[PDB]
């Protein structure tokens, strides 16, 4: 209804130097075990450099650019509303969704060794085949085949 709660933010952590590295105590953190996620922060990115070593200025230049959100879909009910309404996402989502919105196999058959897992997800977001492709690339055709209203 009338809720207008202040927006959450995170500060860059001086041990890792950036805001993009400051969220790996939450992204792939479980059961409230926050220091158990701290155990593998930034050393997972050195393990990513074991699979493609190109330094920190290129560490996320496709591993986020290939997978970031661009559109928000679903309908809006205004009479005969059997269509979808596409809108372009705001810059506050530029680093979001792509490391949270799919667990379809990770909670079903696991997702390989945990200390190697972020080095696998940052490599799989740069390999872009099989898993997590349909949920991303379906809105690159839906927004061209169902766009006659807004």
């Amino acid at each position: 209804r009338r809720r207008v709660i202040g927006q959450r933010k995170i500060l860059p952590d001086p041990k890792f130097g950036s805001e993009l590295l400051a969220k790996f105590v939450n992204i792939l953190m479980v059961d409230g075990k926050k220091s158990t996620a701290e155990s593998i922060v930034y050393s997972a990115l050195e393990t990513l450099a074991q699979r493609s070593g190109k330094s920190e200025l290129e560490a996320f230049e496709v591993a986020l650019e290939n997978v970031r959100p661009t559109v928000e879909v679903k309908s809006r009910r205004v009479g005969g509303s059997t269509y979808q309404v596409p809108v372009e996402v705001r810059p506050v989502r530029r680093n979001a969704l792509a490391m949270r919105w799919i667990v379809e196999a990770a909670r079903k058959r696991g997702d390989k060794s945990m200390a190697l897992r972020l080095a696998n997800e940052l490599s799989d977001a740069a390999e872009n085949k099989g898993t997590a492709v349909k949920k991303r690339e379906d809105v690159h055709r839906m927004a061209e085949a169902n766009k006659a209203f807004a």
Binding site: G80, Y83, K147, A148, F149
Partner: protein, 117 residues
């Protein structure tokens, strides 16, 4: 086929549809489209976008005939009568003149609104 690069566009607009035909000024047809045949039914063909897809679909019938600079002949009361032209300009075409050529019947047949209740 060789490019002919001249023609006249015949546009008709109703309360729920928008129709486009391209002719040479001899009176001879070279392409057609409608906001319905653009792949829309119900009131989806009434949209300002279905009137754009009709313009780009009639332009797909003359793309090898090379027509891009033309004059328009307009019929009917439908609001798509301008929504198809403001979009045709954004599709890369040049418009020289627009003439409203809608007829005015001296009654004859009763107006199809009926009701009579």
């Amino acid at each position: 086929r060789k490019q002919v690069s001249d023609g006249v566009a015949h546009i008709h607009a109703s309360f729920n549809n928008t129709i486009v035909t391209i002719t040479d000024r001899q009176g001879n047809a070279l392409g057609w489209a409608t906001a319905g045949g653009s792949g829309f039914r119900g009131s989806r063909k009434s949209t300002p976008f279905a009137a754009q897809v009709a313009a780009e679909r009639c332009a797909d019938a003359v793309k090898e005939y090379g027509i891009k600079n033309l004059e328009v002949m307009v019929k009917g009361p439908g609001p798509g009568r301008e929504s198809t032209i403001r979009a045709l300009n954004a599709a890369g075409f040049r418009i020289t003149n627009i003439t409203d050529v809608t007829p005015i019947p001296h009654n004859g047949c009763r107006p199809p609104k009926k009701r009579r209740v």
